[PDB]
Amino acid sequence: TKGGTVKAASGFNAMEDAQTLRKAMKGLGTDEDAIISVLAYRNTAQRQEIRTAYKSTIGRDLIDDLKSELSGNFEQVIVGMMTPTVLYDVQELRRAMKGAGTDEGCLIEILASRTPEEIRRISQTYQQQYGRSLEDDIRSDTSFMFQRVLVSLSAGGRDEGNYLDDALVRQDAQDLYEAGEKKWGTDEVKFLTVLCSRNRNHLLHVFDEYKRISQKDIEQSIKSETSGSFEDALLAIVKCMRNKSAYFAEKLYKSMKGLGTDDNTLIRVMVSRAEIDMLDIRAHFKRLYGKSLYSFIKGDTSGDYRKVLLVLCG
Ligand SMILES: [Ca+2]
Protein backbone atom coordinates (compact mmCIF):
# COMPACT_ATOMS: atom_id res chain seq x y z
CA THR A 1 0.00 0.00 0.00
CA LYS A 2 2.63 2.60 1.08
CA GLY A 3 5.83 0.87 -0.03
CA GLY A 4 9.52 1.39 0.86
CA THR A 5 11.47 4.09 2.73
CA VAL A 6 14.53 3.78 0.46
CA LYS A 7 13.99 4.87 -3.12
CA ALA A 8 16.24 5.42 -6.13
CA ALA A 9 18.02 8.75 -5.90
CA SER A 10 17.04 11.20 -8.60
CA GLY A 11 20.35 13.08 -9.29
CA PHE A 12 22.50 9.95 -8.88
CA ASN A 13 26.14 10.29 -10.00
CA ALA A 14 28.00 7.00 -9.44
CA MET A 15 31.45 8.54 -10.05
CA GLU A 16 30.80 11.39 -7.61
CA ASP A 17 29.51 8.88 -5.03
CA ALA A 18 32.66 6.78 -5.50
CA GLN A 19 34.77 9.93 -4.87
CA THR A 20 32.75 10.80 -1.77
CA LEU A 21 33.21 7.28 -0.38
CA ARG A 22 36.96 7.24 -1.06
CA LYS A 23 37.40 10.64 0.60
CA ALA A 24 35.46 9.29 3.63
CA MET A 25 37.84 6.31 4.05
CA LYS A 26 41.23 7.55 2.77
CA GLY A 27 43.89 7.97 5.43
CA LEU A 28 43.59 7.37 9.13
CA GLY A 29 39.99 7.42 10.31
CA THR A 30 36.60 7.36 8.64
CA ASP A 31 33.77 9.77 7.93
CA GLU A 32 30.94 7.34 8.77
CA ASP A 33 28.32 10.07 8.35
CA ALA A 34 29.41 10.61 4.73
CA ILE A 35 29.21 6.82 4.06
CA ILE A 36 25.61 6.78 5.39
CA SER A 37 24.68 9.99 3.55
CA VAL A 38 25.53 8.24 0.28
CA LEU A 39 24.65 4.59 0.69
CA ALA A 40 21.43 4.89 2.73
CA TYR A 41 20.06 7.34 0.10
CA ARG A 42 20.59 5.03 -2.90
CA ASN A 43 18.74 1.81 -3.68
CA THR A 44 20.40 -1.61 -3.94
CA ALA A 45 20.67 -1.40 -7.77
CA GLN A 46 22.28 2.07 -7.53
CA ARG A 47 24.74 0.72 -4.95
CA GLN A 48 25.91 -1.85 -7.52
CA GLU A 49 26.59 0.97 -10.01
CA ILE A 50 28.66 2.69 -7.30
CA ARG A 51 30.73 -0.51 -6.88
CA THR A 52 31.41 -0.54 -10.62
CA ALA A 53 32.26 3.19 -10.63
CA TYR A 54 34.55 2.81 -7.61
CA LYS A 55 36.70 0.30 -9.48
CA SER A 56 36.96 2.51 -12.58
CA THR A 57 37.25 5.90 -10.83
CA ILE A 58 39.17 5.07 -7.64
CA GLY A 59 41.11 1.98 -8.74
CA ARG A 60 39.99 0.07 -5.62
CA ASP A 61 37.28 -2.35 -4.45
CA LEU A 62 34.42 -0.80 -2.49
CA ILE A 63 33.17 -3.78 -0.45
CA ASP A 64 36.78 -4.69 0.42
CA ASP A 65 37.46 -1.13 1.57
CA LEU A 66 34.26 -0.93 3.65
CA LYS A 67 35.00 -4.28 5.33
CA SER A 68 38.51 -3.07 6.20
CA GLU A 69 37.35 0.34 7.51
CA LEU A 70 34.23 -0.65 9.47
CA SER A 71 33.54 -3.08 12.30
CA GLY A 72 30.73 -4.76 14.17
CA ASN A 73 27.03 -4.19 13.63
CA PHE A 74 27.66 -1.05 11.57
CA GLU A 75 29.87 -3.01 9.17
CA GLN A 76 27.21 -5.70 8.97
CA VAL A 77 24.42 -3.27 7.99
CA ILE A 78 26.54 -1.44 5.42
CA VAL A 79 27.95 -4.58 3.79
CA GLY A 80 24.44 -6.00 3.75
CA MET A 81 23.14 -2.83 2.03
CA MET A 82 25.86 -3.25 -0.56
CA THR A 83 24.96 -6.86 -1.35
CA PRO A 84 22.62 -7.63 -4.30
CA THR A 85 19.12 -8.45 -3.13
CA VAL A 86 18.99 -12.15 -3.99
CA LEU A 87 22.59 -12.81 -2.91
CA TYR A 88 21.91 -11.18 0.46
CA ASP A 89 19.11 -13.70 1.13
CA VAL A 90 21.36 -16.51 -0.14
CA GLN A 91 24.19 -15.45 2.17
CA GLU A 92 21.80 -15.16 5.14
CA LEU A 93 20.54 -18.68 4.55
CA ARG A 94 24.10 -20.03 4.27
CA ARG A 95 25.15 -18.29 7.48
CA ALA A 96 22.10 -19.75 9.19
CA MET A 97 23.23 -23.32 8.31
CA LYS A 98 27.02 -23.22 8.28
CA GLY A 99 28.94 -25.07 11.02
CA ALA A 100 27.18 -27.18 13.64
CA GLY A 101 24.28 -25.15 15.09
CA THR A 102 21.39 -23.76 13.02
CA ASP A 103 19.62 -20.37 13.04
CA GLU A 104 16.11 -21.81 12.64
CA GLY A 105 14.45 -18.37 13.04
CA CYS A 106 16.28 -17.05 9.96
CA LEU A 107 15.25 -20.08 7.87
CA ILE A 108 11.57 -19.65 8.85
CA GLU A 109 11.61 -15.89 8.23
CA ILE A 110 13.06 -16.03 4.72
CA LEU A 111 11.29 -19.21 3.57
CA ALA A 112 7.83 -18.17 4.79
CA SER A 113 8.01 -14.51 3.66
CA ARG A 114 9.48 -14.80 0.17
CA THR A 115 7.25 -15.63 -2.77
CA PRO A 116 7.74 -18.89 -4.73
CA GLU A 117 9.30 -16.85 -7.57
CA GLU A 118 11.77 -15.23 -5.12
CA ILE A 119 12.54 -18.61 -3.54
CA ARG A 120 13.34 -20.06 -6.97
CA ARG A 121 15.87 -17.26 -7.60
CA ILE A 122 17.37 -17.77 -4.13
CA SER A 123 17.58 -21.54 -4.62
CA GLN A 124 19.33 -21.18 -7.97
CA THR A 125 21.73 -18.53 -6.69
CA TYR A 126 22.59 -20.65 -3.62
CA GLN A 127 23.38 -23.59 -5.88
CA GLN A 128 25.53 -21.42 -8.18
CA GLN A 129 27.45 -19.80 -5.33
CA TYR A 130 28.15 -22.78 -3.11
CA GLY A 131 27.69 -25.89 -5.29
CA ARG A 132 25.26 -27.13 -2.66
CA SER A 133 21.51 -27.74 -2.74
CA LEU A 134 19.46 -25.40 -0.56
CA GLU A 135 16.97 -28.22 0.01
CA ASP A 136 19.75 -30.70 0.93
CA ASP A 137 21.27 -28.27 3.43
CA ILE A 138 17.83 -27.72 5.00
CA ARG A 139 17.38 -31.52 5.21
CA SER A 140 20.72 -31.88 7.05
CA ASP A 141 20.21 -28.94 9.38
CA THR A 142 16.58 -29.48 10.51
CA SER A 143 14.56 -32.49 11.61
CA PHE A 144 11.10 -34.03 11.73
CA MET A 145 7.95 -32.06 10.87
CA PHE A 146 9.84 -28.71 10.89
CA GLN A 147 12.19 -30.04 8.21
CA ARG A 148 9.25 -31.13 6.03
CA VAL A 149 7.75 -27.61 6.17
CA LEU A 150 11.01 -25.92 5.22
CA VAL A 151 11.80 -28.39 2.41
CA SER A 152 8.33 -27.81 0.99
CA LEU A 153 8.71 -24.01 1.08
CA SER A 154 12.18 -24.26 -0.50
CA ALA A 155 11.07 -26.67 -3.25
CA GLY A 156 8.51 -24.18 -4.60
CA GLY A 157 5.63 -26.57 -5.27
CA ARG A 158 2.95 -24.40 -3.63
CA ASP A 159 -0.01 -23.85 -5.93
CA GLU A 160 0.27 -20.40 -7.55
CA GLY A 161 -2.24 -17.88 -8.95
CA ASN A 162 -5.58 -17.28 -7.18
CA TYR A 163 -8.03 -19.98 -8.34
CA LEU A 164 -10.79 -20.31 -5.70
CA ASP A 165 -12.66 -23.60 -5.26
CA ASP A 166 -15.29 -23.15 -2.47
CA ALA A 167 -15.78 -26.92 -1.92
CA LEU A 168 -12.06 -27.43 -1.42
CA VAL A 169 -11.87 -24.42 0.96
CA ARG A 170 -14.62 -26.01 3.05
CA GLN A 171 -12.92 -29.41 3.03
CA ASP A 172 -9.56 -28.00 4.10
CA ALA A 173 -11.16 -26.07 6.97
CA GLN A 174 -13.11 -29.19 8.07
CA ASP A 175 -9.93 -31.28 7.98
CA LEU A 176 -8.10 -28.73 10.16
CA TYR A 177 -11.04 -28.71 12.58
CA GLU A 178 -10.97 -32.52 12.81
CA ALA A 179 -7.21 -32.40 13.42
CA GLY A 180 -7.99 -30.20 16.46
CA GLU A 181 -10.36 -32.76 18.06
CA LYS A 182 -7.64 -35.35 18.75
CA LYS A 183 -7.19 -36.65 22.33
CA TRP A 184 -3.61 -37.52 21.56
CA GLY A 185 -1.82 -34.86 19.50
CA THR A 186 -2.98 -33.07 16.33
CA ASP A 187 -2.77 -34.47 12.79
CA GLU A 188 0.37 -32.51 11.89
CA VAL A 189 0.57 -33.75 8.30
CA LYS A 190 -2.75 -32.00 7.56
CA PHE A 191 -1.41 -28.64 8.71
CA LEU A 192 1.68 -29.27 6.57
CA THR A 193 -0.34 -30.16 3.42
CA VAL A 194 -2.87 -27.33 3.60
CA LEU A 195 -0.51 -24.54 4.68
CA CYS A 196 2.32 -25.49 2.30
CA SER A 197 0.33 -26.58 -0.82
CA ARG A 198 -2.53 -24.14 -1.32
CA ASN A 199 -2.50 -20.72 -3.07
CA ARG A 200 -2.81 -17.52 -0.99
CA ASN A 201 -6.38 -16.62 -2.05
CA HIS A 202 -7.44 -20.17 -1.17
CA LEU A 203 -5.69 -20.03 2.20
CA LEU A 204 -7.20 -16.68 3.16
CA HIS A 205 -10.61 -18.31 2.52
CA VAL A 206 -9.63 -21.36 4.58
CA PHE A 207 -8.65 -19.08 7.49
CA ASP A 208 -12.05 -17.41 7.31
CA GLU A 209 -13.98 -20.66 7.06
CA TYR A 210 -11.92 -22.20 9.88
CA LYS A 211 -12.87 -19.34 12.22
CA ARG A 212 -16.53 -19.78 11.19
CA ILE A 213 -16.66 -23.51 12.03
CA SER A 214 -14.24 -23.66 15.02
CA GLN A 215 -14.87 -20.23 16.61
CA LYS A 216 -11.07 -19.83 16.87
CA ASP A 217 -8.50 -18.14 14.71
CA ILE A 218 -6.21 -20.68 13.03
CA GLU A 219 -3.30 -19.04 14.91
CA GLN A 220 -4.90 -19.92 18.24
CA SER A 221 -5.38 -23.52 17.20
CA ILE A 222 -1.79 -23.73 15.89
CA LYS A 223 -0.53 -22.47 19.26
CA SER A 224 -2.67 -25.01 21.20
CA GLU A 225 -1.99 -28.01 19.00
CA THR A 226 1.67 -27.76 17.95
CA SER A 227 4.98 -26.75 19.49
CA GLY A 228 8.60 -25.87 18.79
CA SER A 229 10.02 -24.81 15.43
CA PHE A 230 7.17 -26.54 13.59
CA GLU A 231 4.65 -24.31 15.39
CA ASP A 232 6.79 -21.26 14.61
CA ALA A 233 6.96 -22.19 10.90
CA LEU A 234 3.20 -22.68 10.61
CA LEU A 235 2.53 -19.33 12.35
CA ALA A 236 4.98 -17.54 10.04
CA ILE A 237 3.23 -19.00 6.99
CA VAL A 238 -0.21 -17.87 8.23
CA LYS A 239 1.05 -14.39 9.21
CA CYS A 240 2.80 -13.87 5.87
CA MET A 241 -0.28 -15.00 3.95
CA ARG A 242 -2.41 -12.51 5.89
CA ASN A 243 -0.04 -9.53 5.86
CA LYS A 244 3.71 -9.76 5.48
CA SER A 245 4.32 -6.17 6.64
CA ALA A 246 2.64 -7.05 9.93
CA TYR A 247 4.77 -10.18 10.22
CA PHE A 248 7.91 -8.13 9.83
CA ALA A 249 6.68 -5.57 12.36
CA GLU A 250 6.35 -8.43 14.85
CA LYS A 251 9.83 -9.74 14.00
CA LEU A 252 11.36 -6.28 14.66
CA TYR A 253 9.43 -5.99 17.92
CA LYS A 254 10.67 -9.40 19.06
CA SER A 255 14.23 -8.60 18.04
CA MET A 256 14.42 -5.55 20.33
CA LYS A 257 11.87 -5.91 23.16
CA GLY A 258 13.14 -7.28 26.46
CA LEU A 259 16.43 -8.70 27.63
CA GLY A 260 19.05 -8.62 24.89
CA THR A 261 18.84 -7.68 21.20
CA ASP A 262 18.74 -9.99 18.22
CA ASP A 263 20.95 -7.84 16.01
CA ASN A 264 21.12 -10.44 13.23
CA THR A 265 17.31 -10.36 12.77
CA LEU A 266 17.06 -6.56 13.24
CA ILE A 267 19.70 -5.98 10.59
CA ARG A 268 18.34 -8.51 8.11
CA VAL A 269 14.76 -7.21 8.31
CA MET A 270 15.81 -3.55 8.06
CA VAL A 271 18.14 -4.17 5.10
CA SER A 272 15.86 -6.64 3.25
CA ARG A 273 12.61 -4.65 3.62
CA ALA A 274 13.71 -0.95 3.44
CA GLU A 275 12.98 -0.77 -0.29
CA ILE A 276 9.88 -2.96 -0.29
CA ASP A 277 7.41 -2.25 2.50
CA MET A 278 9.06 -0.38 5.37
CA LEU A 279 6.34 2.31 5.40
CA ASP A 280 3.72 -0.41 5.83
CA ILE A 281 5.85 -2.16 8.45
CA ARG A 282 6.02 1.14 10.37
CA ALA A 283 2.26 1.58 10.20
CA HIS A 284 1.55 -1.96 11.45
CA PHE A 285 4.21 -1.65 14.20
CA LYS A 286 2.53 1.48 15.54
CA ARG A 287 -0.93 -0.17 15.45
CA LEU A 288 0.31 -3.33 17.16
CA TYR A 289 2.60 -1.85 19.81
CA GLY A 290 1.52 1.79 20.30
CA LYS A 291 5.11 3.04 19.85
CA SER A 292 6.96 4.06 16.68
CA LEU A 293 9.45 1.68 15.08
CA TYR A 294 11.89 4.61 14.91
CA SER A 295 11.72 5.00 18.68
CA PHE A 296 12.44 1.28 19.26
CA ILE A 297 15.57 1.48 17.15
CA LYS A 298 16.56 4.79 18.77
CA GLY A 299 16.14 3.33 22.27
CA ASP A 300 17.80 -0.03 21.66
CA THR A 301 20.86 0.77 19.49
CA SER A 302 23.62 3.37 19.46
CA GLY A 303 26.44 4.82 17.45
CA ASP A 304 26.74 4.70 13.66
CA TYR A 305 24.77 1.43 13.74
CA ARG A 306 21.78 3.32 15.16
CA LYS A 307 22.26 6.18 12.66
CA VAL A 308 22.06 3.95 9.61
CA LEU A 309 19.15 1.88 10.95
CA LEU A 310 17.21 5.11 11.56
CA VAL A 311 17.69 6.16 7.93
CA LEU A 312 16.48 2.72 6.77
CA CYS A 313 13.43 3.24 8.98
CA GLY A 314 12.71 6.74 7.70
CA1 LIG B 1 40.55 5.31 6.85
Side-chain angles (χ1 to χ4, degrees):
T1 124
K2 308 193 302 183
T5 49
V6 171
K7 299 219 177 285
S10 67
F12 173 38
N13 191 297
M15 182 164 315
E16 183 184 49
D17 290 346
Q19 295 166 326
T20 295
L21 294 162
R22 174 54 175 159
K23 182 180 163 40
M25 295 185 276
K26 189 168 154 204
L28 177 59
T30 312
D31 185 354
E32 307 91 341
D33 291 327
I35 292 169
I36 298 170
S37 80
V38 176
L39 293 180
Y41 293 86
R42 307 292 179 280
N43 72 7
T44 301
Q46 288 179 326
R47 297 182 200 117
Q48 306 320 124
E49 295 269 4
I50 299 171
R51 295 168 68 181
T52 300
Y54 194 89
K55 290 183 173 177
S56 65
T57 70
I58 307 306
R60 299 177 68 107
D61 190 285
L62 181 50
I63 308 300
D64 291 351
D65 286 357
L66 288 163
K67 286 176 169 173
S68 174
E69 284 281 304
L70 308 181
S71 56
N73 292 137
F74 182 58
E75 182 187 350
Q76 184 182 337
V77 51
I78 290 295
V79 169
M81 287 167 63
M82 291 303 307
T83 304
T85 301
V86 175
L87 185 59
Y88 182 64
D89 289 351
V90 165
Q91 291 187 337
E92 285 292 298
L93 290 166
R94 183 83 208 99
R95 182 169 165 239
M97 285 182 286
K98 80 160 68 70
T102 297
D103 182 350
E104 293 188 338
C106 174
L107 302 185
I108 289 168
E109 180 197 310
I110 293 171
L111 292 169
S113 71
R114 275 50 176 188
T115 70
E117 176 273 337
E118 284 168 347
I119 290 173
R120 172 178 179 262
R121 181 141 191 49
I122 292 168
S123 187
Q124 289 175 332
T125 299
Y126 185 106
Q127 188 92 228
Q128 212 166 280
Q129 289 287 309
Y130 302 119
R132 303 183 61 109
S133 165
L134 171 62
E135 284 177 34
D136 286 333
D137 285 353
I138 291 164
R139 289 175 189 121
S140 288
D141 296 309
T142 67
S143 72
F144 303 126
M145 286 303 309
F146 179 47
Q147 182 201 102
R148 293 184 65 186
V149 172
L150 293 191
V151 167
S152 177
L153 297 172
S154 72
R158 180 188 293 294
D159 301 346
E160 304 215 45
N162 62 11
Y163 195 84
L164 186 66
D165 181 343
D166 293 337
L168 183 53
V169 168
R170 293 176 231 117
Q171 189 55 256
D172 281 346
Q174 184 61 29
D175 289 353
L176 296 177
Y177 174 98
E178 290 175 8
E181 288 179 295
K182 302 197 158 210
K183 183 191 186 194
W184 66 74
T186 331
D187 179 356
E188 298 192 334
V189 181
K190 279 170 180 184
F191 282 89
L192 166 74
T193 300
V194 170
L195 291 175
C196 295
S197 303
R198 305 294 189 259
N199 75 54
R200 182 169 179 257
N201 192 32
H202 183 276
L203 285 175
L204 297 171
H205 289 257
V206 168
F207 304 156
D208 290 347
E209 180 70 3
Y210 183 80
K211 179 57 183 267
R212 190 185 77 63
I213 66 170
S214 75
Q215 297 303 104
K216 283 136 178 187
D217 310 303
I218 195 173
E219 296 95 319
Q220 285 187 91
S221 292
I222 288 163
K223 295 177 188 293
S224 297
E225 297 176 26
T226 69
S227 71
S229 280
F230 176 58
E231 177 191 6
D232 290 344
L234 299 181
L235 293 170
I237 295 169
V238 168
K239 289 172 171 177
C240 287
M241 288 290 174
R242 292 188 191 278
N243 191 303
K244 286 173 205 198
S245 298
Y247 171 75
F248 286 111
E250 177 199 308
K251 294 281 304 203
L252 289 163
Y253 179 84
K254 287 185 187 291
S255 78
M256 285 176 282
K257 186 67 165 166
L259 185 59
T261 296
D262 181 2
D263 295 295
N264 287 148
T265 298
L266 175 59
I267 289 171
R268 178 174 55 256
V269 169
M270 291 309 295
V271 169
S272 69
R273 307 306 288 192
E275 294 189 22
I276 300 174
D277 59 348
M278 192 57 60
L279 287 174
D280 304 288
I281 292 174
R282 278 166 54 184
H284 287 279
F285 188 100
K286 182 65 182 295
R287 289 296 190 192
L288 289 165
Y289 300 118
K291 302 296 186 70
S292 70
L293 172 59
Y294 181 100
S295 73
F296 261 61
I297 293 170
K298 181 210 177 280
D300 199 52
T301 66
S302 66
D304 293 318
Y305 177 44
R306 168 165 62 179
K307 290 178 168 183
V308 62
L309 293 179
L310 297 170
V311 182
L312 294 180
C313 186

